[PDB]
Amino acid sequence: SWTKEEEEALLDGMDLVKGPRWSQILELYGPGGKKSEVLKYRNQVQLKDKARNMKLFFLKSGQVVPAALQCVTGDLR
Prior knowledge:
By secondary structure, the protein is mainly α. The protein has helices at residues 4-16, 22-29, 44-60. It has a domain at 19-71. Binds the telomeric double-stranded TTACAGG repeat and regulates telomere length.
């Protein structure tokens, strides 16, 4: 079963690769996106800043946070 070294590696790797893959959202919805191009004018920083504001809106209003927004962590200001 799992060793302490393995558990520290998992937590460490998860930390290093955490946060949504913003470029993959733009593969679906950005310029030439596979589903549409509706997000094509948004760069990855704009996607991340909007996601933080959306999570903060759900929290502020006492609404359930959509599962994917729970991946957005840290300072939302």
